[PDB]
Amino acid sequence: RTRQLQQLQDAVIEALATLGDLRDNPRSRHLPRIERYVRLLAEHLAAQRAFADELTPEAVDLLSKSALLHDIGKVAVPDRVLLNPGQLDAADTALLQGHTRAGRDALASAERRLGQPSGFLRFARQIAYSHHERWDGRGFPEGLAGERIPLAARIVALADRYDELTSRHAYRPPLAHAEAVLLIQAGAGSEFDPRLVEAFVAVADAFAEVARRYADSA
Amino acid sequence: RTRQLQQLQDAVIEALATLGDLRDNPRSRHLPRIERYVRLLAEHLAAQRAFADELTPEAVDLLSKSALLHDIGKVAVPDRVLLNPGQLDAADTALLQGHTRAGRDALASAERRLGQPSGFLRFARQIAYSHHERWDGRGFPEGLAGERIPLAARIVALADRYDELTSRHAYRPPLAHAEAVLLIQAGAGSEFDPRLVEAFVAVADAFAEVARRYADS
Ligand SMILES: [Cl-]
Ligand SMILES: [Cl-]
Ligand code: NI
Ligand code: NI
Ligand code: NI
Ligand code: NI
Incomplete structure (x- = not known):
């Protein structure tokens, strides 16, 4: 019926999120992978009583598509910080962390424009702000902890870590799937909601399939 | 129902276009001004028979909204170039110019994803690529001339120059409206299509109003 506009939105968002990665992550399939990793985890969680209210099939779909915008705030990070492979002094780390606030502000201003929320x-706004929060309260930028982190940001944090481990960086090749799994498991209760870790372990073979099929070009 | 989606698209596009200005033009109302300067010109041209085919009232609306993305490509320009207030050596100038190509490529890849017109x-694509082309063929990145520049990019080039003359820069304060008008008239047949200059002259008072009301804070 009104697919024409929904498809146009998806294409535009995909294109521009991709530009937003150009400075620190060019030539990558990060974004379509993250989307699928999020969807898989959200679908599995939707079958369980603790999450089914929040994760209707409509919510799962919106959540997954909005995960594409997690890092659009990186334009607030100067080249010298963003392209520095080494360790950052504390004021530069603060600039890098501010990607979350900048994405949050832009998306919240877009929200205030709408009559029907x-x-x-x-x-999208919850994710951009809170995607580097940690279950134990030691992440940034607010140090939210436990169920005070919005569910969507908790899902994305895990997807994002899996993706980072199983893709290329200047310092290394991707980690093998089995090792990434043990590394994500190790973060249960500190980095990640232990229930999301449990969901991840049940869908991990599907994650390995997405990582292979949507692998970066060589 | 269709409104809900159209309002959502407008909100998202404006947010992302605004983030695209953050590095070299933060705290600015460039984008809402530009959109209105485009719409004004386009609405006047649409009256004319010559442009009326291409500028239907639906086209006017899409054209205006797409003008927001003109400079989205500036993420392909490194900080050291984009933030340099002086004259640029020729290889840095080429990097600055490549904002047009990088915007073009992102929007074409979206047209491929969508796979329908x-x-x-x-x-949006035409504007991002050609908004710095000049009627006399001396612009960039291709040196297109005359009607070989897409209409949308010809409209935006004029709007963009008006905005740049009547807003702040490190070098100077804004030019007064009356002087900006003369200056734009002076570019007829070199920078700009002379028929767009005619249209601009007929809507110039409205341009002055947008410039004042949407002035920077
Ligand atoms: Cl797959
Ligand atoms: Cl006005
Ligand atoms: Ni990312
Ligand atoms: Ni991030
Ligand atoms: Ni601009
Ligand atoms: Ni430009």
């Missing part, structure tokens, strides 16, 4: 923009 | 994406 948008689930899409609300998930 | 979108007036919105087509306008």
Whole structure:
């Protein structure tokens, strides 16, 4: 019926999120992988009582598409910080962390424009802000902890770590799947909601399939 | 229902275009000004028979909204170039110019994803690529001339120059409206299509109003 506009939105968002990665992550399939990793975890969690209210099939879809915007705030990070492979002094680390606030601000201003609130923009905004929060309260930028982190950001944090481990960086090749799994498991209760780790372990073979099929070009 | 999605698209595009200005033009109302300067010109041209085919009222609306993405490509320009206030050596100048190509490529890859015709994406793409072309063939990145520059990019080039003259820079304060008008008239047949200059002259008072009301804080 109104697919024409929904497809146009998806294409535009995909294109521009991709530009937003150009400075620190060019030539990557990060974004379509993250989307699928998020969807898989969200689908599995949706079958369980603790999450089914929040994760309706409509919510799962919006959540997954909004995960594409997690890092659009990186334009607030100067080249010298973003392209520095080494360790950062504390004021530069603060600039790198501010990617979350900048993404949050832009998306919240977009929300205030709408008469009928948008689930899409609300998930996108929660994710952009809170995707580097840690279950134990030691992440950034607010140090939220436990169920005070929005569910969408908790899902994305795990997807994002899996993706980072199983893709290329200047310092190394991707880690093998089995090792990434042990590394994500190790973060249960510190980095990640232990229930999301449990969901991840049940879908991990599907994660390995996405990582292979949507692998970066050589 | 269709409104809900159209309002969502407008909100998201504006947010992302605004993030695209953050590095070299933070705290600015460039984008809402530009959109209105485009719409004003386009609405006047649409009256004319010569442009009326291409500028239907639907096209006017898409054209205007797509103009927001003109400089989205500036993420391909390194900080050291983009933040340099002086004259640029020729290889840095080439990197600055490549904002047009990088915007083009992102929007074309979106047209490929979508795989059906979108007036919105087509306008956006043409604008991002050609908004610094000059009627006399001396612009960049291709040196297109005359009617070989897409109409949308010809409209945006004029709007963009007006905005740049009547807003702040490190070198100077804004030019007064009356002087900016003369200056734009002076570019007829070199920078700009002379028929767009005619249209600009007929809507100039409205341009002055947008410039004042949407002035930077
Ligand atoms: Cl797959
Ligand atoms: Cl006005
Ligand atoms: Ni990312
Ligand atoms: Ni991030
Ligand atoms: Ni601009
Ligand atoms: Ni430009």
